[PDB]
């Protein structure tokens, strides 16, 4: 990990990086997710796994650095959005540029949030029994996760 | 009208019973 | 500790099969409450009437009317006002004088 220092003269210093735990359980896996047998076994709640692919201010790291495949990169990206919206990453908040403070508006607790709350409109005509409009819960990208329920998860609430 | 999960299974169960009925009428 | 249910609340459960395998024997002695799990009685200050009277204190206009009284009663017993109103004489005369009693 290299950091740029300015003085004009500016230079970048490379520092030693923490090393991955050796001897993955499943060597020969391309994606780092499959070298540890995590293909379908992580959700938004798993901050410990998700945090590793996140920039200090909450952005996702580029795929070419993480080494994830596209299928798992998109799942990590979506899980991170849901984790952020659930307030599970209090230390990866956006940087405040200058003369900006947090909105101070009270925070509503939410989880399994597919979309940004700003841009989702209210359902004014909810519909009757068979034309009921569904409130989406979870993400479609995680439709293949291992399920421990008798029936598949109820995405539309 | 989407067909329910319970409705689909009960038809399959009956089909299997009739499927065996084919076997026992073949000898 | 073979029982699959904790033995600490209702009774101890011991399930056993007879050697033949045709009877199931259950030994269930009751659990007594430990002394350390109890509180001392609040000796300093009682009939249930006294408790009732304090809750239904007569404060305004001596005896209150039906409206104010019923609202006081409803709050004390966590009921609605409607329960406390009387009924007419059709219903009152329909009520059985001697309802059946079981033990």
């Amino acid at each position: 990990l290299r950091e740029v220092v300015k003085i004009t003269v500016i230079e970048g210093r490379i520092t030693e990086t923490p090393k991955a735990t050796p001897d993955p359980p499943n060597p020969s896996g391309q994606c780092p997710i499959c070298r540890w047998n995590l293909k379908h076994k992580y959700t938004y709640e798993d901050v410990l796994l998700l945090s590793q692919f996140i920039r200090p201010y909450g952005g996702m790291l580029p795929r070419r650095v993480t080494g994830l495949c596209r299928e798992e990169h998109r799942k990590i990206e979506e899980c991170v959005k849901m984790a952020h919206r659930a307030g599970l990453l209090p230390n990866h908040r956006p940087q405040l540029p200058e003369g900006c403070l947090p909105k101070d508006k009270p925070k509503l607790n939410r989880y399994l949030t597919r979309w940004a709350p700003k841009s989702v409109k209210p359902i004014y005509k909810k519909g009757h029994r068979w034309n009921k409009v569904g409130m989406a819960v979870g993400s479609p990208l995680l439709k293949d996760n291992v399920c421990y329920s008798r029936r598949p998860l109820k995405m539309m609430h | 009208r989407t067909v329910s999960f319970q409705a689909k299974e009960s038809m399959i169960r009956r089909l299997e019973v009739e499927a065996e009925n084919h076997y026992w009428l073949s000898m | 500790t073979y029982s699959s249910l904790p033995d600490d609340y209702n009774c101890q459960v011991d399930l056993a099969l007879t050697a033949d395998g045709r009877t199931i024997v259950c030994y269930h002695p009751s659990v007594d409450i430990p002394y350390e799990h109890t509180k001392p009685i609040p000796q300093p200050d009682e009939t249930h009437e006294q408790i009732l009277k304090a809750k239904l204190e007569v404060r305004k206009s001596k005896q209150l009317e039906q409206g104010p009284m019923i609202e006081q009663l409803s709050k004390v017993f966590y009921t609605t006002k409607h329960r406390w109103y009387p009924h007419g004489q059709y219903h009152n005369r329909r009520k059985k004088l001697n309802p059946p009693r079981d033990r």
Binding site: - | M11, I12, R14, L15, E18, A19, H22 | -
Partner: protein, 50 residues
Amino acid sequence: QRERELNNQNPWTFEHIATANMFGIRKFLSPYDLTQKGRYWGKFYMPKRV
């Protein structure tokens, strides 16, 4: 289309049920349905139907 039919993992198929009158199903089916085998409904063609 041919690959889908061969590798289908559903034991039950429209053709077998229709031809054998399993479930008493032909009460609710047209005479032409046996030939179509569920692929064609009215003037519509259902490619995903094997």
